[PDB]
Design an enzyme around this catalytic site. Structure first.
Site, PDB file in Angstrom:
ATOM      1  N   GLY A   1       0.811  -1.201   0.000  1.00 15.17           N
ATOM      2  CA  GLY A   1       0.000   0.000   0.000  1.00 15.17           C
ATOM      3  C   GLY A   1       0.847   1.254   0.000  1.00 15.17           C
TER       4      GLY A   1
ATOM      5  CG  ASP B   1      -2.372   0.571   7.517  1.00 15.72           C
ATOM      6  OD1 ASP B   1      -3.079   1.523   7.128  1.00 15.72           O
ATOM      7  OD2 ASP B   1      -2.190  -0.471   6.852  1.00 15.72           O
TER       8      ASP B   1
ATOM      9  CG  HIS C   1      -8.066   4.939  -1.519  1.00 14.03           C
ATOM     10  ND1 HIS C   1      -7.028   4.053  -1.317  1.00 14.03           N
ATOM     11  CD2 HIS C   1      -9.186   4.188  -1.634  1.00 14.03           C
ATOM     12  CE1 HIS C   1      -7.501   2.820  -1.308  1.00 14.03           C
ATOM     13  NE2 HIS C   1      -8.808   2.875  -1.497  1.00 14.03           N
TER      14      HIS C   1
ATOM     15  NE  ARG D   1      -2.379   3.576   0.295  1.00  6.82           N
ATOM     16  CZ  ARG D   1      -3.015   2.489  -0.127  1.00  6.82           C
ATOM     17  NH1 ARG D   1      -4.104   2.033   0.477  1.00  6.82           N
ATOM     18  NH2 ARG D   1      -2.552   1.842  -1.192  1.00  6.82           N
TER      19      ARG D   1
ATOM     20  CG  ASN E   1      13.797  22.498  19.106  1.00  5.60           C
ATOM     21  OD1 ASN E   1      12.777  22.142  19.697  1.00  5.60           O
ATOM     22  ND2 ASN E   1      14.844  21.701  18.944  1.00  5.60           N
TER      23      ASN E   1
ATOM     24  CG  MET F   1      12.082  34.000  11.581  1.00 10.83           C
ATOM     25  SD  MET F   1      10.635  34.391  12.581  1.00 10.83           S
ATOM     26  CE  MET F   1      10.378  36.100  12.143  1.00 10.83           C
TER      27      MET F   1
HETATM   28  N1  LIG Z   1       5.342 -13.886   2.461  1.00 10.27           N
HETATM   29  C1  LIG Z   1       5.390 -13.527   1.054  1.00 10.27           C
HETATM   30  N2  LIG Z   1       6.020 -14.297   0.180  1.00 10.27           N
HETATM   31  C2  LIG Z   1       6.074 -13.988  -1.107  1.00 10.27           C
HETATM   32  N3  LIG Z   1       5.496 -12.895  -1.570  1.00 10.27           N
HETATM   33  C3  LIG Z   1       4.839 -12.055  -0.756  1.00 10.27           C
HETATM   34  C4  LIG Z   1       4.768 -12.354   0.587  1.00 10.27           C
HETATM   35  N4  LIG Z   1       4.057 -11.375   1.166  1.00 10.27           N
HETATM   36  C5  LIG Z   1       3.711 -10.500   0.236  1.00 10.27           C
HETATM   37  N5  LIG Z   1       4.173 -10.900  -0.935  1.00 10.27           N
HETATM   38  C6  LIG Z   1       3.989 -10.206  -2.176  1.00 10.27           C
HETATM   39  O1  LIG Z   1       4.703  -8.778  -2.092  1.00 10.27           O
HETATM   40  C7  LIG Z   1       3.597  -7.734  -2.309  1.00 10.27           C
HETATM   41  C8  LIG Z   1       3.221  -7.061  -0.999  1.00 10.27           C
HETATM   42  O2  LIG Z   1       2.184  -7.766  -0.375  1.00 10.27           O
HETATM   43  P1  LIG Z   1       0.789  -6.966  -0.018  1.00 10.27           P
HETATM   44  O3  LIG Z   1      -0.127  -7.869   0.773  1.00 10.27           O
HETATM   45  O4  LIG Z   1       0.103  -6.553  -1.297  1.00 10.27           O
HETATM   46  O5  LIG Z   1       1.142  -5.625   0.872  1.00 10.27           O
HETATM   47  P2  LIG Z   1       2.224  -5.609   2.114  1.00 10.27           P
HETATM   48  O6  LIG Z   1       3.189  -6.756   1.966  1.00 10.27           O
HETATM   49  O7  LIG Z   1       3.001  -4.316   2.083  1.00 10.27           O
HETATM   50  O8  LIG Z   1       1.494  -5.736   3.428  1.00 10.27           O
HETATM   51  C9  LIG Z   1       2.540  -8.420  -2.835  1.00 10.27           C
HETATM   52  O9  LIG Z   1       2.588  -8.336  -4.248  1.00 10.27           O
HETATM   53  C10 LIG Z   1       2.696  -9.974  -2.370  1.00 10.27           C
HETATM   54  O10 LIG Z   1       2.183 -10.848  -3.395  1.00 10.27           O
HETATM   55  O1  LIG Z   2      13.991  33.832  20.325  1.00 11.26           O
HETATM   56  P1  LIG Z   2      13.124  32.831  21.051  1.00 11.26           P
HETATM   57  O2  LIG Z   2      12.596  33.455  22.321  1.00 11.26           O
HETATM   58  O3  LIG Z   2      13.943  31.608  21.390  1.00 11.26           O
HETATM   59  O4  LIG Z   2      11.863  32.403  20.087  1.00 11.26           O
HETATM   60  C1  LIG Z   2      12.047  32.507  18.707  1.00 11.26           C
HETATM   61  C2  LIG Z   2      11.409  33.789  18.234  1.00 11.26           C
HETATM   62  O5  LIG Z   2      12.275  34.732  18.212  1.00 11.26           O
HETATM   63  C3  LIG Z   2      12.139  35.373  16.843  1.00 11.26           C
HETATM   64  O6  LIG Z   2      13.260  35.799  16.425  1.00 11.26           O
HETATM   65  C4  LIG Z   2      11.109  36.501  16.881  1.00 11.26           C
HETATM   66  O7  LIG Z   2      11.771  37.731  16.827  1.00 11.26           O
HETATM   67  P2  LIG Z   2      10.948  39.072  17.316  1.00 11.26           P
HETATM   68  O8  LIG Z   2      11.650  39.681  18.505  1.00 11.26           O
HETATM   69  O9  LIG Z   2      10.900  40.076  16.189  1.00 11.26           O
HETATM   70  O10 LIG Z   2       9.542  38.687  17.708  1.00 11.26           O
HETATM   71  C5  LIG Z   2      11.627  34.163  15.945  1.00 11.26           C
HETATM   72  O11 LIG Z   2      12.795  33.259  15.641  1.00 11.26           O
HETATM   73  C6  LIG Z   2      10.847  33.554  16.678  1.00 11.26           C
HETATM   74  O12 LIG Z   2       9.461  34.055  16.536  1.00 11.26           O
HETATM   75  O1  LIG Z   3      -6.194  -0.640  -2.051  1.00  8.25           O
HETATM   76  P1  LIG Z   3      -6.116  -1.426  -0.769  1.00  8.25           P
HETATM   77  O2  LIG Z   3      -4.917  -2.267  -0.786  1.00  8.25           O
HETATM   78  O3  LIG Z   3      -7.340  -2.299  -0.634  1.00  8.25           O
HETATM   79  O4  LIG Z   3      -6.039  -0.368   0.522  1.00  8.25           O
HETATM   80  C1  LIG Z   3      -7.185  -0.196   1.314  1.00  8.25           C
HETATM   81  C2  LIG Z   3      -6.952  -0.908   2.644  1.00  8.25           C
HETATM   82  O5  LIG Z   3      -5.334  -0.862   3.014  1.00  8.25           O
HETATM   83  C3  LIG Z   3      -5.145   0.293   3.582  1.00  8.25           C
HETATM   84  O6  LIG Z   3      -4.835   1.282   2.617  1.00  8.25           O
HETATM   85  C4  LIG Z   3      -4.031   0.176   4.621  1.00  8.25           C
HETATM   86  O7  LIG Z   3      -3.118   1.262   4.450  1.00  8.25           O
HETATM   87  C5  LIG Z   3      -6.497   0.628   4.286  1.00  8.25           C
HETATM   88  O8  LIG Z   3      -6.804   1.918   4.114  1.00  8.25           O
HETATM   89  C6  LIG Z   3      -7.570  -0.299   3.589  1.00  8.25           C
HETATM   90  O9  LIG Z   3      -8.082  -1.266   4.549  1.00  8.25           O
END
Ligand SMILES: Nc1ncnc2c1ncn2[C@@H]1O[C@H](COP(=O)(O)OP(=O)(O)O)[C@@H](O)[C@H]1O
Ligand SMILES: O=P(O)(O)OC[C@H]1O[C@](O)(COP(=O)(O)O)[C@@H](O)[C@@H]1O
Ligand SMILES: O=P(O)(O)OC[C@H]1O[C@](O)(CO)[C@@H](O)[C@@H]1O
Ligand SMILES: Nc1ncnc2c1ncn2[C@@H]1O[C@H](COP(=O)(O)OP(=O)(O)O)[C@@H](O)[C@H]1O
Ligand SMILES: Nc1ncnc2c1ncn2[C@@H]1O[C@H](COP(=O)(O)OP(=O)(O)O)[C@@H](O)[C@H]1O
Ligand SMILES: Nc1ncnc2c1ncn2[C@@H]1O[C@H](COP(=O)(O)OP(=O)(O)O)[C@@H](O)[C@H]1O
Ligand SMILES: Nc1ncnc2c1ncn2[C@@H]1O[C@H](COP(=O)(O)OP(=O)(O)O)[C@@H](O)[C@H]1O
Ligand SMILES: Nc1ncnc2c1ncn2[C@@H]1O[C@H](COP(=O)(O)OP(=O)(O)O)[C@@H](O)[C@H]1O
Ligand SMILES: O=P(O)(O)OC[C@H]1O[C@](O)(COP(=O)(O)O)[C@@H](O)[C@@H]1O
Ligand SMILES: O=P(O)(O)OC[C@H]1O[C@](O)(COP(=O)(O)O)[C@@H](O)[C@@H]1O
Ligand SMILES: O=P(O)(O)OC[C@H]1O[C@](O)(CO)[C@@H](O)[C@@H]1O
Lengths: 741, 741, 111
Positions: B13, B154, B286, B289, B518, B560
């Site tokens: 997927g 997932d 989807h 996705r 940060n 910044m």
């Molecule tokens: N245990 C396995 N052995 C061989 N081929 C696998 C195996 N598992 C998955 N595949 C193949 O690799 C692909 C991925 O499997 P799929 O069920 O579609 O999604 P995912 O493996 O990511 O969960 C598929 O085409 C599948 O046929």
């Molecule tokens: O400098 P701090 O207190 O760590 O927080 C980051 C802030 O400081 C800043 O420089 C803001 O500057 P100002 O003094 O003009 O508000 C930005 O990087 C950001 O908004």
């Molecule tokens: O096209 P697919 O393989 O059926 O994806 C749909 C299913 O797999 C997932 O995409 C998992 O990521 C789920 O959203 C859903 O159950």
């Protein structure tokens, strides 16, 4: 200029954008001097009365212009349909002395509002009869004025070309489509999409056209019999001919010839049975009913609120109930009843299976858009094989939309059988060769990419004119379709006056205006403007949030756009800037002192924040650092100030829905105009274009498309400032200064 | 350090981010000196071979990092399970001379890949026996190396915290939820949301916690008997107690005690039947996705891709197959099989209805998150009603996340019966009074809004310390929870140091680090950094699209971060900058000349663009204008240059998933520690807090939460430049430089 | 300035925060004004000074000179004054800027 009171409500299905309209109506109602009352829960609170209705101040509608939905509910009432609910609502209005009302909602809400108006007098008579009120009060409030606003994402209101909020819904649908298209192209899976809309297919068609979907379903044009086989043939042809993914869009009310609804599950079962391609379906639901409103949505919502307040103050009892809509590019005013009955006539028309009559009744624009969609959806085998040769160029700075326009032009040209060439890097390319033929498959997927993959340059043609003429003669190019900005217009002009010296320049050329500044003469909107305004609006909203975080602060923003002020004004309108300094509106130091006094006064209130824009070349000497120093000094102790320069971030990322669609429309129409002019001017075995009408700029005027000659526009252009003499959008500056205290 | 070939492919997927993974793998493989091939269509093209596998250059993986899905297909194969397809794939790989192979996808693809490693010798024996290959070829490729990248939204993989792409899926979910909440509030409607996740409710849990939903359904903790009565009670309590809208989230794998699936249609029918509230059900489809991957997805994919390349090239045939995963905030390495059987055992235990055992097997972090969500979702009736009082402050520049932390802290404090105050405008307000108690309903909806509503100021306490102590004694405050940036830490340090001179400051002071730069000591992530990284990510991608629009262009972007180059470094990694200049990496003029000549070398190639990030104060003389003058000079005749300043736009809009969750988790845990110590030091009828452990900074250390004393951190803080002596993210600069030519 | 009629000069003298040097040199050369930290001024004073320059430019003496201590105000830079005088004085005169740097330290000491 007024001494009366105003009431406002929104009702019906919410569409993102009502917040801007309610802000504008209440703020003008205060500015004009009238009293304004907010009706909560729509008709439910109107009937209930009491705390449901309350006065508002200037600050009551702040911090909402960027928010979708509505702050006052807009809930669906049942008692309003009854006589007892209507007289109770009238009793509440007279108790609060409301004589003018503004309503936001769908067709039913305004029908009920006009029903309430039509018997307001009778309601007053029996209200006096039961002794609830005195006769003097009934005489004072003997009339009720109604102004209406259409808020609905469906865009089914036929009297309005664009209903409030549809552009934001177009943003939400397409970002979902873009997310879906990535996984679809990845896994080579065909998908079916379900868009919102009660019984209207505007949204489905616009999304399909803006996404190049392989097939569409709409109620306006139900599919003909045996559509299953044509579906299989087209999808097989697409997926066979390099089209990795297929997109199917279906309005929720799509029907067949018999009017029977076509379920997406049926379509999925059919495609799986007949082709076996892996496929999915995604019902989008209420996503279209939310999200941040588009900049065009906020501007239009505020403008309709502006006009609604003006209509309410200038209306009379004999005047019928009126609505404000869009005709061409102006805020027109139409009667509510006539639009209601015409909408009902179109509704029975589609219900009565007279689909064509419903099509002509509603309008002639969307049938043409559907025709363009069918033309460009698949490669129809061309038969003409005309000797005409065309070249497409990119000139100016990069902008949102040129990719879709060039894609439209090339596919239309291949459909017409012409030999099409594509020049990379514009006039500089033509001087240095860099020309290649293009095919139908060679341009797929360009509809969803911003900027220009072909590239653009600021080079002008007169510097290398001899090499341009040499390359023209070598490749035998017989037409030019330049898509670009002002520099494209300048280059085409220089070629036009160069026709006398060089005989080979007797050629047909057309310009597609595409630039963020929106300074190209011969049009009222340039391709890529809307994307830039959306980017600037989002960025300025983020600055507003940052300023509100640290109260008592003001921000200086330097928006791009050369000398033109369109981008600055629309951004200030969208984000409620306290001022927008523009070249066309000269200002001295006393004006800045006045604005400083305005901000200092506003700092005493609860909304302790401010944002003032500045077009990058509004004043020769008063740079942005001038304004920062002046505001910081004169506001010492009261507030602080900061500066920002929205750089090329205003050139946007993925293009917007309107820009994609508008580029495709202009590409088709310009190609038709070329094919037209070529077939007239061909004589004695050679092309010979000498009349000035062979050099025109395709553009959308106030109403529709036109082809103004480039030399004719010479008398309307400021080449020193690179902007036309007069511009239509100057009216919006009054609105911008209005919406600030 | 290599003389071999590397192979890459994606399967399973699709989870947006594989483009970043293959980019980092390809570019690291080329840098190390190993040949690289892109295997299209996953295992299907692997078995098919031929054109499906092709060599890749440095430019093969250019301009894909910002794209969702994958560029190499990822088709599903059936013969891949059969030994015939296995030998055919092994034949294709030996024909192309590939001895190492990197797999991207889910658990099943890894199981197949381990099976390939387990029988590679047998396949080569069969190929030699049938005469396809020579003996020398078999000896050369006698072994196969497998490195697996867990790409699946997932997030079911037990041994990893974050799989490649799960953050992007959370971003998609919360964009949709923020859209829905506007209309849900407008129409007072309840919405039932169906979330993806094959058989795990992590995405459902994180989304519900970050959205403040009213009830959740997950498979890990199925609901107890008679849960429907608890549904009715909670929904009635919320709708009655000022909650305008109600949100119900359900995992697609949701189950009951009997393991039977719970349909969203059932939940809609139940709520309508038992309460009659207007409600709706929305399936995201989807949409999760696809889309543009978030910044955390790109950085994580890049680091895991580098580590996988390192693992392949440092592996030996005796070494078993291993993967790269997350422990703390580093790329750890685990064996493939052990995690596979652990995941299978967890799935079996869930199927066997031993839901408690499944919860214990996932990890105590999920259980604590479940307990936190239960504590915060609804107001439990308090009973202790202690005599303690609290005050909460916002300090430093406003950072996206402060509101979430304040809401979580306030509600947790209300549950423990303490009276909690909120001080507007930080320490300045605390001197100026403006202290008010806050109730449960008074902080509703703060989770979903950025900025800081209490208001923040950069003022420090020592200037008004007498008034601070006066207000403390008047309100009888007994502890402070000062959430903020470095100014918060410095202010609390001043108060702790001033405990000797006054008695009232013997009071417990907790600090929550919340600043985009940060730079607060004692933590690895500061609340609100992730939003700023993502905002700068979009901005830089938009600039690069504009740059590619004008071929032959370079951009100088000033970001910044105070002096800390955390924000500039991570953003440069996020958008593939050519170089990011930072104070922590000193640079002279010679390095700039070296960078310029490198830029000219790149400009000779097809990708004629550039980008460099400059921290806002990376150098005291080399301002951004200096760099523009230098680049425009030394690149004359080859390209041009521009400058952009991402000012307060980097503070971002709505906070991302991680910031909402991190704010909530810190608010709860900080409040719990504060209540614990406040109950510890209460004796003989008066609070008295003198020991250094009475003042700490809550922070997420390398593994989990820890409370560092505020004074003890003083030896690891650079008060001159306001940043810690040592920072963990210095390793990332190596990635930033190596991934650029 | 007197040579090219209708011209004004903004001279940024040194002196730290003290404006002794700016004041006394303004007296010694008859400057139109000498902005100094010890005399705080706002935009209204600058507008008045521009207005005096506008009136004065109608007479025969079509020149001007305004001094400024290097740190006489936190915000009103010499570039700011140059823009203000040129803008509000448009149509009647132009302006130029100078910075008497370490020339102020002088050559040989006076007696
Ligand atoms: N245990 C396995 N052995 C061989 N081929 C696998 C195996 N598992 C998955 N595949 C193949 O690799 C692909 C991925 O499997 P799929 O069920 O579609 O999604 P995912 O493996 O990511 O969960 C598929 O085409 C599948 O046929
Ligand atoms: O400098 P701090 O207190 O760590 O927080 C980051 C802030 O400081 C800043 O420089 C803001 O500057 P100002 O003094 O003009 O508000 C930005 O990087 C950001 O908004
Ligand atoms: O096209 P697919 O393989 O059926 O994806 C749909 C299913 O797999 C997932 O995409 C998992 O990521 C789920 O959203 C859903 O159950
Ligand atoms: N024909 C009508 N007469 C009186 N009131 C009406 C009428 N139609 C609608 N309303 C009022 O407007 C409310 C919303 O109507 P609805 O059909 O749900 O959508 P909309 O009004 O937007 O077309 C109704 O609940 C009612 O109060
Ligand atoms: N891309 C499309 N989306 C929706 N309907 C289409 C599309 N293309 C063709 N149709 C419709 O299917 C029918 C056949 O297509 P058409 O354009 O008429 O080709 P032809 O000229 O061979 O008849 C027409 O009725 C047309 O309206
Ligand atoms: N997002 C927008 N930005 C700017 N103008 C718009 C926008 N949307 C609509 N308009 C204007 O209203 C018209 C509505 O377009 P439409 O009726 O669908 O067909 P067409 O654009 O071909 O005339 C547009 O032509 C345009 O003038
Ligand atoms: N806010 C909530 N969201 C989702 N599920 C909940 C929520 N509150 C309660 N539940 C479910 O109902 C059960 C009862 O809640 P609980 O914490 O045990 O209260 P108590 O033990 O005091 O009776 C919980 O175990 C949980 O499964
Ligand atoms: N978007 C992110 N940004 C930074 N770090 C992240 C992000 N997502 C996950 N992490 C890291 O993985 C951890 C995810 O925590 P999680 O598994 O949801 O349970 P808990 O939050 O209770 O620890 C985070 O603490 C962090 O170290
Ligand atoms: O808007 P114009 O006049 O057509 O010029 C296009 C570009 O020129 C600008 O000034 C910036 O130029 P560059 O992007 O080439 O540096 C913008 O207003 C605009 O993006
Ligand atoms: O003027 P001060 O502050 O007494 O110091 C003496 C020198 O300092 C100055 O500011 C000059 O600064 P520098 O010599 O460091 O450039 C003058 O006032 C003077 O020449
Ligand atoms: O769930 P809701 O809000 O009733 O949506 C249904 C109706 O909403 C609408 O979009 C109203 O604009 C109609 O298309 C539809 O009939």
């Amino acid at each position: 200029g007024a001494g009366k009171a105003i009431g406002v409500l929104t009702s019906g299905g919410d569409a993102q954008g009502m917040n801007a309209a309610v802000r504008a109506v209440t703020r003008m109602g205060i500015y004009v001097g009238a009293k304004v009352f907010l009706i909560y829960e729509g008709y439910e609170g109107l009937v209930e009365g009491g705390e449901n209705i309350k006065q508002a101040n200037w600050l009551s509608v702040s911090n909402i212009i960027q928010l979708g939905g509505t702050i006052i509910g807009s809930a669906r009432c049942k008692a309003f349909t009854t006589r007892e609910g209507r007289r109770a609502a009238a009793y509440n209005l007279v108790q609060h002395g409301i004589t003018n009302l503004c309503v936001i909602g769908g067709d039913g809400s305004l029908t009920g509002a006009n029903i309430f108006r039509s018997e307001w007098g009778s309601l007053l008579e029996e209200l006096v009869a039961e002794g609830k009120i005195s006769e003097t009060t009934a005489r004072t409030y003997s009339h009720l004025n109604i102004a209406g606003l259409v808020g609905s994402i469906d865009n089914d209101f036929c009297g309005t070309d664009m209903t409030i909020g549809t552009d934001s819904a177009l943003h939400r649908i397409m970002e979902v489509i873009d997310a879906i298209t990535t996984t679809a192209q990845s896994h080579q899976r065909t998908f079916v999409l379900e868009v919102m809309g009660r019984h209207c297919g505007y949204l489905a068609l616009v999304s399909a056209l803006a996404s190049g979907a392989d097939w569409l379903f709409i109620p306006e044009a139900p599919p003909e019999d045996g559509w299953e086989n044509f579906m299989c043939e087209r999808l097989g042809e697409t997926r066979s001919r390099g089209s990795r993914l297929n997109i199917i869009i279906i309005a929720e009310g799509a029907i067949d010839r018999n009017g029977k609804p076509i379920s997406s599950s049926y379509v999925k079962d059919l495609v799986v049975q007949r082709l076996g391609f892996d496929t999915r379906v995604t019902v989008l639901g209420h996503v279209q009913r939310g999200g941040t409103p588009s900049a065009f949505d906020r501007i239009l919502s505020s403008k309709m609120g502006m006009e609604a307040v003006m209509a309410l103050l200038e209306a009379t009892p004999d005047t019928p109930a009126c609505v404000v809509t869009l005709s061409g590019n102006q805020s027109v005013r139409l009667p509510l009843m006539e639009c209601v009955q015409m909408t009902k006539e179109v509704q029975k028309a589609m219900d009565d299976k007279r689909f064509d009559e419903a099509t002509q009744l509603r309008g002639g624009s969307f049938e043409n858009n559907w025709n363009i969609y069918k033309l460009l959806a698949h490669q129809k085998p061309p038969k003409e094989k005309s000797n005409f040769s065309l070249a497409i160029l990119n000139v100016g700075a990069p902008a949102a939309g040129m990719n879709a326009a060039v894609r439209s032009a090339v596919r239309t040209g291949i459909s017409h059988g012409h030999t099409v060439y594509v020049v990379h890097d514009g006039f500089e390319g033509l001087a240095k060769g860099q020309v290649q033929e293009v095919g139908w498959h060679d341009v797929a997927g360009w509809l969803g990419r911003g900027g220009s993959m072909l590239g653009t340059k600021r080079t002008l043609p007169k510097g290398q004119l001899e090499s341009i003429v040499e390359n023209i003669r070598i490749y035998g190019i017989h037409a030019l379709l330049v898509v670009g900005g002002f520099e494209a217009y300048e280059g085409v002009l220089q070629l036009v006056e160069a026709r006398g010296r060089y005989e080979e320049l007797c050629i047909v050329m057309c310009v597609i205006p595409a630039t963020i500044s929106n300074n190209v003469p011969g049009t009222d909107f340039s391709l890529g403007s809307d994307t830039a305004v959306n980017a600037a609006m989002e960025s300025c909203d983020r600055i507003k949030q940052s300023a509100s975080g640290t109260k008592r602060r003001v921000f200086i923003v330097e928006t791009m756009g050369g000398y033109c002020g369109y981008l600055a004004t629309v951004t200030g309108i969208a984000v409620g800037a306290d001022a927008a300094y523009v070249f066309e509106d000269p200002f001295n130091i006393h004006d800045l002192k006045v604005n400083v006094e305005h901000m200092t006064e506003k700092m005493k209130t609860d909304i302790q924040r401010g944002l003032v824009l500045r077009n990058e070349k509004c004043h020769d000497y008063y740079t942005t650092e001038f304004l920062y120093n002046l505001y910081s000094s004169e506001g010492k102790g009261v507030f602080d100030c900061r500066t920002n320069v929205l750089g090329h971030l205003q050139q946007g990322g993925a293009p917007t829905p309107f820009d994609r669609n508008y580029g495709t429309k202009l590409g088709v129409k310009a190609m038709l105009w070329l094919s037209e002019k070529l077939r007239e001017v061909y004589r004695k075995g050679r092309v010979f274009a000498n009349a000035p009408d062979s050099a025109c700029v395709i553009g959308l005027k106030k109403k529709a498309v036109a082809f103004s000659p480039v030399t004719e526009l010479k008398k309307d252009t400021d080449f020193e400032h690179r902007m036309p003499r007069e511009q239509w959008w100057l009216s919006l500056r009054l609105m911008l200064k209005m919406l600030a205290q």
